[PDB]
Every structure is written in structure tokens, then in C-alpha cells.
Amino acid sequence: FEPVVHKTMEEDEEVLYKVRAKLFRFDADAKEWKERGTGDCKFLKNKKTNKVRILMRRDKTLKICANHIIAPEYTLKPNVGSDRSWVYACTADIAEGEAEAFTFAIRFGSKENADKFKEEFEKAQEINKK
Amino acid sequence: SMEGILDFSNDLDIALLDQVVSTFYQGSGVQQKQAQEILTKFQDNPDAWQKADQILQFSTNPQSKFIALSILDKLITRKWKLLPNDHRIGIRNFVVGMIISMCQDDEVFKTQKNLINKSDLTLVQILKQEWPQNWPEFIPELIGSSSSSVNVCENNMIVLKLLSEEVFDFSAEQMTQAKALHLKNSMSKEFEQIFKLCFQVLEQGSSSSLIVATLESLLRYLHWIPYRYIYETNILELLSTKFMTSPDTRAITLKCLTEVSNLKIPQDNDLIKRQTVLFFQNTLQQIATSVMPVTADLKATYANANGNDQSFLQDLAMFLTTYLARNRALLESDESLRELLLNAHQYLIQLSKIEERELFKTTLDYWHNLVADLFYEPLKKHIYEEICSQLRLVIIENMVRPEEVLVVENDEGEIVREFVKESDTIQLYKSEREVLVYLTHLNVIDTEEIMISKLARQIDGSEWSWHNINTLSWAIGSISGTMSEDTEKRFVVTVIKDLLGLCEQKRGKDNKAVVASDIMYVVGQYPRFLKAHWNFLRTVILKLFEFMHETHEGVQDMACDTFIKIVQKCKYHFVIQQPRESEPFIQTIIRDIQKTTADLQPQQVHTFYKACGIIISEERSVAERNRLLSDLMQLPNMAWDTIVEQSTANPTLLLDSETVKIIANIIKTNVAVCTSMGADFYPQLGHIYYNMLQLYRAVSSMISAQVAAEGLIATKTPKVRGLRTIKKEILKLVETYISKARNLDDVVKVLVEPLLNAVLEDYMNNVPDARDAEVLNCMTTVVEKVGHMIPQGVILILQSVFECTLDMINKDFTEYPEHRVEFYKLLKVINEKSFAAFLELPPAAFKLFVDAICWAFKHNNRDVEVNGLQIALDLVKNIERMGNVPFANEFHKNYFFIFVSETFFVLTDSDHKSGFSKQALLLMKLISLVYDNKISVPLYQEAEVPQGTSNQVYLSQYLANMLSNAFPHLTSEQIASFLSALTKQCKDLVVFKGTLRDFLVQIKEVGGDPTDYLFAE
Amino acid sequence: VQFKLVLVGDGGTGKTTFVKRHLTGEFEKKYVATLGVEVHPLVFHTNRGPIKFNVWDTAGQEKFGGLRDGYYIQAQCAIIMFDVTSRVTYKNVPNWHRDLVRVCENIPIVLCGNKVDIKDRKVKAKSIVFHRKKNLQYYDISAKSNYNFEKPFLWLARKLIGDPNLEFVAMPALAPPEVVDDPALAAQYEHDLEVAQTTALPDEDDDL
Ligand SMILES: Nc1nc2c(ncn2[C@@H]2O[C@H](COP(=O)(O)OP(=O)(O)OP(=O)(O)O)[C@@H](O)[C@H]2O)c(=O)[nH]1
Ligand SMILES: *[C@H]1C(=O)c2c(O)cccc2C(=O)[C@@H]1C
Ligand SMILES: *[C@H]1C(=O)c2c(O)cccc2C(=O)[C@@H]1C
Ligand SMILES: [Cl-]
Ligand SMILES: [Cl-]
Ligand SMILES: [Mg+2]
Ligand code: NA
């Protein structure tokens, strides 16, 4: 008896770290932070290159608000307002198309999360050197 | 290149206009933005209207012609009466001529529906200005032209539709009362001719586009035409049969039949009743034969969303509910109408299964209307048993999440904490419970059996799912109050027993979290049961304690909220000793309070102590209550005592950010207990009061030191936000206590002086960014409860906060938003309760008081604006109460006309429409002051006006001058007639308001009729 | 595949805020009145490919209205916006709707009550019935909390594509540049990074 007849680009990556976060970019002209998105921050290790990137998608729209290599060169810095955020300059984020530079800030739900993120961020940097 | 069209010195290049229009509508990026600005300037140029004839003749771009009509529409509505007679006739001619020409070319009539519907609106604007006083034969000649061409016949149905809309549906806001009445009367006079033309097309008309347009015109006529046009012709039969069979006329007919199901109709005449029954019989017949049978799955139809099915099912829902709400009694007595009554209701049952929140609410409104009537109306409910029984299943199976349930399923399928309140869902849940409560009374055996048997199919796992245990539990909870103590006893026992079995069986944190949230919703909803059954209540409370030790934040949070909820209703059963118990349950809870709350986050621990507060306030013996209180506060008082011995041994231990957190949590714990115990909190407050005010002082210095060392950016640091939180929570604790206190002596003699000494100077002498708005809030509660007992204390509050807070908020409407709000709340209560304080201001500062009030008017922030107008009203009454004494006479000379003109400015500027009612009431009170000769001295200065002439006469002369200069396009007579009417109406608010709305219409145009202000007289 | 969307409603209702949240992710707190119209491309990714809305964000203030109903010509869908904290903005929903359907007969339209995040709500859910007879979809939304912020676009996409099962899906994610400039060798680093550290992040009292 005949039967009744019937790509994210993350399938080749492994999830090392996941944390809920809000991401901002600094607008140098206006001198204010502007939100770029709220959602899951993921550290994704490519199984073929062992390269680790940040990838972060906005809740509901699933649109990319961060896509960049966790570069050895980058440095996490505190922000005067917050014991649960980091600030750093990224020179190649492709979330909104062509490679652009940004000063990001990323805030978490608790200092614990921010301290874990920093620990994981530096682990991924070691992975990217080798 | 494109900027050429703005240069009016040269002839308008029409090819260029058309490119600029194309670039805007069809282009993109900078080119489109460039074109947008050029077109907006072209259109606003006040001589652009002189070019419209040129553009309508020569343009090859419909959108250019659309914009020419926009330009004309702005001239017709606002400056028409200044045009000389030749220009009005000419413009009339080429609009009428353009319309006819466009209709007589079939290709234009087909493709350019936008441009024609805009021309038709523009013509209706000319009718609002000219008809019928300078165009008496418009309607007859429109009827005439209709038979020349099917296109012109149809287009003329659109013109009359627009005319009906502008005169009956949208007149209230856009014309004076007099002019709306004139145009209403004018259409009413000529409707007989209009209806006969409309009726001929419905009987005889071939063209589907012409029929549709005719019926669209009739939808509008049904808002206002007398019933005799609907009931004494054949139109009901036509709509309810012929126009329902064709799908291209079905939507608009069904909307016409909905409006008919509301027409104004006599309820004492058997033949009008038969006709109302008939069109309904006819419509339900056409639906059952031509669209779908009663048994059809409307849910699936709606989900598939083919063509206009969603629209049609929406309009059907609206038709059935409108008609049945008004007329179901007509089908309820006659046995020949029973099948039709129940089939109509069956259509609504099928519609109520559709997955679409807003439709579901539309039907649920109807179900409420029905089950409410069946609850009260004798001999009716038996008719609807089978409908009511089906409705029970629909609602139990589509219950949405109550406010109380804090666990919810996310879009990766995890059971998580609820991110935010869904006001939409919460209201829907309440609407569902009102219906389901009613249905339960109508048949309590049916409701129990449905719920009991659904529970049995969760037990044995056959229909088990998170959706299915959730809807059942929410429904089971929603019906508390509907049963007897006895069936409730067994019902609830069975539900609790069986739900506890689901929790004990089911594995994984997701399953346990769901079942636990359901157990908690249910037991929370049945206080009556819990009161009577100590062992159950005790075990539910002991189970809430077990959930407070779960890893899932949602389960924990809800356990605390359920605890509060149970305790608000069962507090008595914890305060006394039950039989078979060692001690009152309160005392057992207070012992283990450290163990039972160990895994709770702080704001949940605080909720827990608030609950203990509620229990403790059930004990009325003063001895026991002060003790229980002292026993509860052991942990935080023990932390407080050790934190105050360290903190005063050196001001530097507070730097420890951990100690700032511990401290704020101890004050938050006190805030929580005070919230629920109110006036019974006094002993515990006093155990910390003087030491707590010293911490306020200590913390305040560190804040000021940090700002000076690090700059303003210090206010943003974790350290300083932590310190400011200690200050806010202390203010909140005192605010909370004083709001509820009964012993007001102790408040004035023990609490007030140290509080004012601790907070006022520190507020006045800190930089704007370091000032806590909570100080103003605290002070509002102090003035409200004890102001009358502390006149000099109120003076002291004003001096400390008035000028410095005003200086923060008087540069713009945005900065220091909390300050702005709390500020105007403080000045309202002071002006209400302690007005002497304003008498004791130096004249310069009283002048800033008046400037601050008027500044509040001009806010679009509602919290400020409403307080602004209330202060102004209360001030005017305070002043009036003083009578004929120098300060009141000086007040009126200095400030009367400033209040009048500042009230007029916000009335007439079109940016404060939210405050219209209160503005009008203030302006009325001010004008009426002068009439009732309550102002005891001349408002005018010495050599301005004849000696002896009254404040009344001068009020009108000042106001005529003020409006003449503020609105120079008005005539002297418009201003004279407006004021004459406005003044006579200073006791009748509704009429006065009407005269103001009339003025607001006339100031947006030229040549308003002065006699319009006689509408009331 | 692109559709003209007009966004209309009273001044201060949150139209430009709503659009900016969708374009960039940002929450604009200031009220800068739109002058006539601003057009913004907005793309969403769906299980039926990309859908693009040309969003014609219009002025609500009379004195800044510009071309007014002139903006509605050839619109394929629309959003009417009012403010649940401001009764006058709901009382004006019928006037915006009138002006719109006289130009755009038979297009899909969403009614949006914005600012439901605000505690003291003036236009209660039970008041909001205007959409029923006019066949508008209604949503409670908040551009601030993002409550239901995606729904207007998801519903409209469903009606314009004629597929009621259409979902937003995870937009593809290309491997990002692995060779990058050390930002610490670019001179303005010290000036850019100090300014960013010493400007406080907004809303430090939010949950994120
Ligand atoms: N609390 C809250 N405020 C909001 C929300 N959306 C917008 N606002 C604020 O309300 C104001 C309205 O901003 P706009 O978006 O410019 O208003 P608009 O409707 O575009 O006004 P016009 O351009 O004049 O028609 C801003 O200060 C916003 O930050 C919301 O969801 N919640
Ligand atoms: C206009 C009209 O066009 C018409 C058609 O098309 C058919 C039958 C009757 C009429 C009229 O009398 C209407 C004037
Ligand atoms: C009240 C009123 O205010 C008034 C003024 O001020 C001038 C002239 C006539 C009147 C009235 O008749 C009103 C009763
Ligand atoms: Cl004018
Ligand atoms: Cl609500
Ligand atoms: Mg805007
Ligand atoms: Na009727």
C-alpha cells in the first residue's frame, strides 16, 4: 500500500556558553548608549576551524544583534554605572551586513552572570589563539 | 532641479511637478526625502491653490492631481469665505466638471478610483460651505445626472455616502453645534428624494459595483434615517434574501443588517416585530444554504483564511450578537421560532471555538449578556440548556492564565518565570470567569461532572498535557463561590487529593512546576474551604513552604504570593491555638522563619514577613500583638543592632557594598511588615527610629562626599545607588507608617521634628542630581495626615523644597520627571489642607507659586496637568473664602487676568485637549467670580476706563481685546457674540463647554457665523 | 517582495519609537515629532523567504502633518497607533481610520494600543472595541517592554503573503571575519573607550 506522499548557519557549531543579555552600542555622535538587542548570547565554536564567535539573536524576531569572533586582541572593561556589564571595542561585527567597528556594552541579569561571561570570554580567546 | 516648483515668480513646470511626485511615491533614499520636503513646501505655500486648475488639466500623474485637491481641501475648509464670489463659483465648476469628465471615461473610472474618491470628498467640503443656502438644487440635479451614466450613478452614491459621513458621523468635532444642526436638518429635508434613488438601484440595478456602492451609502444612512424607510418598504426582504446570496454584496448587506438590528423602533406593534423576526429568518436561511451549515467547523475555516472568510465570520459574529442581544425575546415564546433561535446560538457556539482573541471576546460579551439574563429572567434558562452545556466545554477548554500564575511556557518549550503582566490576558480571564460563574449557577451538576471527568482523564494520562491540566485548573479555580459548602467540600477535597497525586507521580522540574502552579492557583481560590478544615489549611501552608525550597524561581515566587492570598482571608486561623495543636500556628511559622525562607531571594523574604504582619494584626490584645511583632522582627533587629554598633564605631564600614545591601534589606523588611500592620507597626518603628534617622544622615554625607570627589557621574555608580536606596527605603517606611497611623499625637510630637531635621536641609543643600524625589512624596503624606497640626512645619517644608525643586523642573517639560510629579502633588495637598503656609510666602515667592501653577497647565504629562488645574481651582476658592481683605484684593489685581489668559491659552492652543473639562471648569469659576461680585476692587488701573464702571464690563472688554490680538482672523462680532454667550453660561458647565468647543471650531477657519453662539439660547 | 505600510495616529503615541525599535533595536526615550513622514525599509525573515515593508511613519501632530492622506496612496497595509495612557488618542482612532480607508479601501490594518507597560492605564481593555465592526486586528503593545512588538508585522505578513502558517525564522549567520585589526593600535581607542566607560548605561534598574 503506497504511502500518503510528503539554514541558520549554526549546524556546524557547538554551544560552549549561553547567557541571557542586553547588548548596546555606543553612539559617539550623540554620546549615548543605544540598545542593539535583548536575547540569548551564545559562544559558538566552529567544529571545523575551532574558531569561537559571539552570536546573539533578538527575542521574537530572532534577528542577529551580534556576530563576531571573540578576538584575542579585545579587552572587557567595566562601565561606571554597572557591576554587571562589560564594555569593549569590536573591529568586525557582521550582524547588520558589511564588517563594521563598534564599541559594545553587554549587561546581564546579575553580577554572577557577568563574572561567568568574562571567564568564558577569556576561555574562548585562548581557544582562538591556537 | 526639483526646487523649481517652489519658485512661484515663474510658471509652474507641470512635467517637473510630476517628476517630484514620482520621485516621492516611487523613488527611495535621499531623492525621496528631498522630494518629500519640496512637495510639503509646495503644498503649504498659501498661493498653491491658484495652481490646482493647471495641475488637474495638464498633469499626467494622478498623485499630482490628488495633491492639487489636498491644496484645495485646505483652502475650502479654512479660508473659503475670504475668496470673492467668482473664485468660489469657478472652483465649484472645475471640481464638478473634473468629476463628471472622470466618470464618463470608462478607463479613468476603472483605474483612478483614488483620484475620484478624493474629488468626491473635495466636493463634499464645498457642500459643507455652500449647501443648501447657495446651492439649493444640488440634490435634485445630482438625482438628475444619475440616469445619464451608470458610472455617474455609482459615483453619486459615493458623494452622498461621504456627505452622510461628514454631516452625521464626523460633525461633532469639526462644526459648530449650529452648523451640524443646519446640515443635519438640510439632509433630513431631502432624504425622501435620496432614498427613492437608493431604493430604485437596489430593485432595478444591474451593475455589482453600483449595487455595492449603493448599499455602502445605506450603511451610513442607517445611523440616522427614520425606521419607516426600512420597515415600510421592501428593503428588508431585499437585504435579507437577494443581497445575501451574491458574495460581492454579502459583507455590506450583513453590516447593513447589523445596523438595522439597532434602528430606533416601537416595541408595542406585532407587525414591526414579525418583520424583525423575518429578516433574521431570511438571513440565517441564506447562510445555511449559500455559505455553510450550522455543523461546519468555523474554527478550521477561520484558520485556513481563504479570501474574505475571516472578515465574513467576524461580521456574522457581530450580526448574530447585535441582533440576539436586542431581539432574542421575539424568538423565545413562539414554538415555530425555537429551531431558528437555537440554530443562531449554535452558529455562535461554532464561532466561539475560533482561535482569535478579539473575535472570542466579541462572542464572550454576548454569552455574558445571555447567561446573566438566564440567571435573573424567570422561565428562560430551560430553552438554552444544550447551548449552555456546549458553552461550558468551550470556556473550560479555552481558559487563559490568571494574574496569580507566575509559571508559563516559552517558545523553546521550557516552563519559565513570567517576564511581564499581560493586562489583555488578565481582563480576558476575568470575562471568562464571569460567564463560567453564571453557567455554574445555571447547572452546577453539569459543571462539576465536566470538571470531575476532565480531571479523571489527567489522572489516567489519556488527555494529559500542560495545556490541559492548566485550563482545567484555572477553570476549577475560577468558579469558587458557585457551590454549596458541601459539594465544594467534596469537589475541592477530590481536586486537591488528585492534583497532589499528579505532583507526586510526574517527573522532571518542568512537570512539577506546572502541577505545583495549578495546586497553588486552586487552594488560593478556595479560602472558605480552608477556614473550615484546619488539617488541610495546615498541610497546604506546609506544602507552600516545600515549594519555597524549589530550584524554580516561579514556583517559589508564587508560593509566597499564594501564602499572602490565603493569609489575607484565613489570618484568624493562624493567630489562635487550634484544638490538637501545641501553639498558635503563627508562632511555629515565626520559629522556622530562617529555615523556611533560607532559599528565597530577598524581595520574596520581604513578601513572607508582610504575610506574617497580616496574621499578627488579627491579634487585637495590645500585649500579645506588640510581642508577636517583636518576635517576628528578631532576625532583622538582630542584624540591625550588630550593623548599628559597627556603623557608629566608624563611618567607613558603610563603604562595604555588602553592608549597604544588608542594611537596605533590613529597611525593606520593615517596609514590608509596616505595609500590612499600619498603625500596629509603631513599637517596631520606634525600636529603630532615631538610629535609622542617624543612618539617613551618615549615608547622606557619604553620598555628598562621593559626588564632590568623583563628580555627578557618582550618582550612577553601584556604590551610590546602593546608598540612595537606603535613603529611599527609610523615607518609604516613614511614608508608609504615617499614611496608616491612628495615633496622630505621637506622629506630630515624636516622629515629625526629627524627620524634617534629618531630610529637609539635606534635600535643599544637595546638587539637583542628588535630590531624592521620595522626599517630596514623604512630605505629601506628612502634610496630608498631620498638616493641620504643624502649620510652621508646613512653612518649613515649603521653604526647603519649593524654590529649589521649581528651578529643577521649569526649563523644560522632560527633566526630573519624578520630581515634577511629586512636587505638584505636594503643592496640591498644602494648598488643600494648609493654605496659611502660602499666605506666609514673601510676594516674590507667591509669584513663583502662580508661575508654577500655570506651568503645570502647559504640561502634557497628565499627572502634572490634572494637579495644575486642581491647584488653580482650589487657590481661587481659598482666595474667595478670605472675603474683602487686602491679600485677596491684591491677589485679584495681580493674578486674576493671568489665570484667565493662561486658561484661555491652553483651551485654544490645540496641544492640551486632554485637560479640556478641567480648563473649562476653571475658566467658568473665574468668569463667575466677577459676575457674583466676589472681587471687591476694580481689576482695571486708574486712568484706563470710566470711573465706577464694573469689573463685569471690563472683563468682556479685556477678553475682546485679548482674543482680537490672539486671533486676528476673527471678526469683532464673532468675538462679541462668543463672549456674550460664554458669560451668560457661567452656571451651566455643559453649555459653556459647548460654546468653548464652538469657538475652537471657528478659530480654525475664516468667516464663522456669529449667531452660532445662540444655539443654547 | 516589498509592501507599503503606513503608520498613523496621534502625536506622542509611539509610532517612531515602535519603528526605531524594529530597525536598530533601540529604545528612543525623547519625543522628537516626525515632520510629515519618514520612510524606513524593514525586512523580516520567514519560512516563506524575506518580506520587506517600506514603513511610511507619519506625523500625528496637525501642524507637522505635511501631505496627510497624500501619504496613504498605494499603501498595501497599515498600523493605527494610540496610547493606552491617553483617552484622547483612542477617541481619535476613528478619525485616523476614516482618513485612511477613504484612500485605502480593503487593505489589512492593525490597531495598536501602545505603552501598556505604564502602570496607570486610562484606556481599559473593555473600552477597546472599535476594531470589531471595521475588521482591524487589535494588539496591546509596548515599544518599551517589547510586549507583542512583533505581532503587527507577523499578522500583516500572514495577510499579504496569504499564508496563515507563516512564522519568523532564524536569519542565516555567516562565519564572521577571523582576521581583524587590534583596536588598541588605532590611536582614538583611548579616547573612544574612556568616553564609553564613563557614560552610564541607561535603565540600570531593569531586569536586563
Ligand atoms: N512607557 C512607554 N513610553 C513609550 C513607549 N513607546 C514610546 N514611548 C515614549 O513616548 C514618546 C513618543 O515618541 P514618538 O515615537 O516620537 O511619538 P510619535 O507617535 O512618533 O509622534 P509624532 O511623530 O509626533 O506623530 C517618546 O518619549 C517615547 O520614548 C512605550 O511602549 N512605553
Ligand atoms: C443610476 C443607475 O445607474 C441605474 C442603473 O444602472 C440601473 C437601474 C437604475 C439606475 C438608476 O436609476 C440610478 C439613477
Ligand atoms: C455669569 C457671569 O459670569 C456673567 C458675567 O461675568 C458678565 C455678564 C453676565 C454674566 C452672566 O450672566 C453669568 C450668569
Ligand atoms: Cl485659520
Ligand atoms: Cl486593562
Ligand atoms: Mg513620530
Ligand atoms: Na430591527
Question: DSSP state, C13?
Answer: S
In whole angstroms, what is the distance from residue C199 CA to residue B1006 CA?
A: 53
Residue B132: is the preceding peptide bond cis (ω within 30°)?
A: yes
Query: What is the CATH number for A96?
Result: 2.30.29.30
| Helices B657-677 and B682-710, packing angle to 10 deg | 140
CA–chain centroid gap for B299, Å, is 31
Distance from CA of B726 to the nearest CA of A (A): 18
- Give strand pairing partners of C38: C57
Query: What is the CATH classification number for the domain harbouring C7?
Result: 3.40.50.300
3-state helix, strand, coil in chain C (%, to 5): 30, 20, 50
Residue ID of nearest Cα to ligand 2 atom 7: B205
- Beta strand extents in B14-124 (DSSP E only): none
- All three cell numbers of B672, joined, read 514590608
User: Which of B114, B310, B863 faces C103 most closely, judged by CB atoms?
Assistant: B114
Q: What is the pairing mode between strands A13-27 and A32-46? A: antiparallel
Mutate to test the pocket of ligand 3, among B900, B939, B949, B952 (most ligand atoms within 8 A of CB): B952
Residue-range definition of the domain harbouring residue C13: 1-208
The number of folded domains in chain A is 1
Q: Residue B486's CB: how many other CB atoms inside 10 A? A: 8
Q: Which cell numbers in the block locate residue B384?
A: 438554552
Please state, in angstroms and as integers, the Cα–Cα distance from residue B749 to each residue in B755, B833, C64, following that order: 11, 19, 58
Resolution (A): 2.3
Dihedral-angle region of residue A97 (phi above 0 means left; psi in -120 to 50 means alpha; beta otherwise): left
B334-338 LR contacts (CB < 8 Å, sep 24+): B337/B277, B338/B383
Ligand 3, atom nearest to B927 Cα: 3
Distance CA(B144)–CA(B138), nearest Å, equals 10
CB contacts, 8 Å: A60 with chain B: 411
Looking at the structure of chain C, the number of domains it has is 1
CA distance B899 to chain C (A): 25
Name chain C's partners: 3 or more CB pairs within 8 A. A, B
Point out the ligand 1 atom lying closest to the alpha carbon of residue C32. Answer: 16
To test the pocket of ligand 1, the residue of C10, C17, C141 to mutate (highest count of ligand atoms within 8 Å of its CB) is C17
Q: Are B724 and B658 in contact (CB under 8 A)?
A: no
What does residue A110 show for φ and ψ, rounded to 5 degrees?
A: -165, 155
3-state secondary structure chain A: CCCCCCCCCCCCEEEEEEEEEEEEEEECCCCEEEEEEEEEEEEEEECCCCCEEEEEEECCCCCEEEEEECCCCCCCEEECCEEEEEEEEEEEECCCCCCEEEEEEEECCCHHHHHHHHHHHHHHHHHHHC
Please give the Cα distance from B1003 to B858 (Å, whole number).
20
Q: Which of B304, B428, B713 sits opposite C200 (nearest CB)?
A: B713
Read out DSSP for B857-883?
HT---HHHHHHHHHHHHHHHHHHHHH-
In the structure grid, which three cell numbers stand for residue B708, read together? 564632590
Region of C74 (left: φ > 0; alpha: ψ -120 to 50; beta: rest) is: left
Question: Is B314:C135 a contact under the CB 8 Å cutoff?
Answer: yes
**Cβ-based contacts of B411 with chain A (< 8 Å):** 60
**Residues flagged as binding site of C:** 10-17, 28-34, 60, 114-117, 142-144
Half-sphere exposure of B47 (CA within 13 A, CB side): 7
Q: What is the dihedral of CA B439, B441, B446, B448, to 10 degrees?
A: 110
Q: Count of alpha carbons within 13 Å of B869, Cβ hemisphere only?
A: 26
| Contact residues, C window 133-192, toward A, CB-based 8 Å cutoff | 146, 149-150, 168-178, 180-184, 186, 189, 192
- Rounded distance between C-alpha atoms, residue B785 and residue B796, angstroms: 16
Which residues of chain A are within 8 Å of residue C208 when distances are taken between CB atoms? 20-22, 38, 107-109
Which structural technique was applied? X-ray
**Among candidate residues A48, C118, C98, the one with its CA nearest the CA of residue B863:** C118
Q: How many CA atoms lie within 13 A of B1000 on its CB side?
A: 22
**Of B613, B826, B909, B643, residue with least CA distance to B737:** B613
Pocket of ligand 1, beta carbon within 6 A:
C 11-17, 28-34, 59-61, 114-115, 117-118, 142-144
Those residues whose C-beta lies under 8 Å from the C-beta of residue B677, and which sit 6 or more positions away, are: B613, B614, B616, B617, B629
Single-letter code of the amino acid located at B819: H
Q: How far is CA C33 from the centre of its chain?
A: 15
Start-to-end C-alpha separation, chain C: 36
Distance of CA B452 to the CA centre of its chain: 40
CB-based contact B788:B833 (threshold 8 Å): yes
C171, C198, C208 ranked by CB distance to A62: nearest: C171
Q: Report chain B residues whose CB lies below 8 A from the CB of C67.
A: 36, 39-40, 43, 67, 70
Q: Is the CB of B927 under 6 A from ligand 3?
A: yes
Side by side, the strands of the sheet bearing C137-140 are C37-46, C49-58, C2-8, C77-83, C109-114, C137-140
H or E segment at C111?
strand C109-114
Cα angle B975, B979, B985 (rounded to 5 degrees) comes to 150
Q: Can you give the three-state secondary structure of B498-537, one letter per residue? A: HHHHHHHHCCCHHHHHHHHHHHHHHHHHCHHHHHHCHHHH
**Strand, helix or coil at C113?**
strand
For a mutational test of ligand 1's pocket, the pick from C22, C31, C32, i.e. the residue with the most ligand atoms closer than 8 A to its C-beta, is C31
Contacts of C21 (CB under 8 A, 6+ apart): C27, C143, C146, C149
Question: In whole angstroms, what separates CA B714 from the centre of its chain?
Answer: 39
Please report how the helices B634-649 and B622-632 are oriented relative to each other, as an axis angle in degrees rounded to 10. 60
**Any bridge partners for residue B416, and if so which?**
B408
- C56 bridge partner residues: C6, C39
Identify the sign of the CA torsion B159, B164, B167, B171.
Answer: negative
d(CA B34, CA B16): 14
Rg of chain B over Cα atoms, rounded to whole angstroms, equals 36
Q: Could you tell me if the CB of B901 is within 6 A of ligand 3?
A: no
CB spacing of C87 vs B914 below 8 angstroms: yes
What's the gap in Å between B194 CA and the centre of ligand 2? 13
SS3 annotation, B203-272: HHCCCHHHHHHHHHHHHHHCCCCCCHHHHCCCHHHHHHCHHHHCCCCHHHHHHHHHHHCCCCCCCCCHHH
β-pairing verdict for C77-83 and C2-8: parallel
Contact C196, A87 (CB under 8 A): yes
Q: Chain-centre distance of CA B703, in angstroms?
A: 40
Q: Which domain, by its residues, includes A111?
A: 1-130
Of B70, B318, B362, the CB nearest to C70: B70
Ligand 3 proximity of B847 Cβ (cutoff 6 Å): no
Please give the grid coordinates belonging to residue B304.
Answer: 485556513
Residues B630-659: b if buried by 16+ CB within 10 A, e if exposed: eebbebbbeebeebbeebeeeeeebeeeee
**C-alpha to C-alpha distance for B803 and B806, rounded to whole angstroms:** 5
Long-range contacts of C126-135 (CB under 8 A, 24+ apart): C126/B427, C126/B431, C127/C90, C128/C90, C130/C90, C130/C93, C130/C94, C130/C97, C131/B358, C132/B314, C132/B318, C132/B358, C132/B362, C133/B255, C133/B258, C133/B318, C134/C97, C134/C101, C134/C109, C135/B310, C135/B311, C135/B314, C135/B315
Going by C-alpha positions, the residue among B729, B737, B783 that lies closest to residue B756 is B783
Contacts of B128 (CB under 8 A, 6+ apart): B77, B166, B167, B175, B183
**C2 three-class SS:** strand
Rama region for B305: left / alpha / beta (φ>0; ψ in -120 to 50; rest): left
At B831, the amino acid letter reads N
C-alpha distances out from residue A37 to A24, A30, A40, B421, B977, Å: 7, 19, 10, 21, 59
- What spatial distance separates the first Cα and last Cα of chain A, rounded to whole Å? 57
CA distance B679 to B674: 8
Contact call for residues B1016 and B995 (beta carbons, < 8 A): yes
Q: Which 8-state DSSP code applies to residue B172?
A: T
Residues in chain C: 208
Classified as helix, coil or strand, B945 is coil
Rounded to a whole number of angstroms, the distance from the CA of C91 to the nearest CA of chain A is 31
Of B536, B628, B522, residue with least CA distance to B573: B536
**What is the Cα–Cα distance from B243 to B251, expressed in whole angstroms?**
9
Question: How many CB atoms are located within 10 Å of the residue A26 CB?
Answer: 23
Nearest beta carbon to residue C201 from set A21, A31, A85: A85
CA atoms within 13 A on the CB side of A126: 6
Collect all residues of chain A within an 8 Å Cβ-Cβ radius of residue C202: 32-33
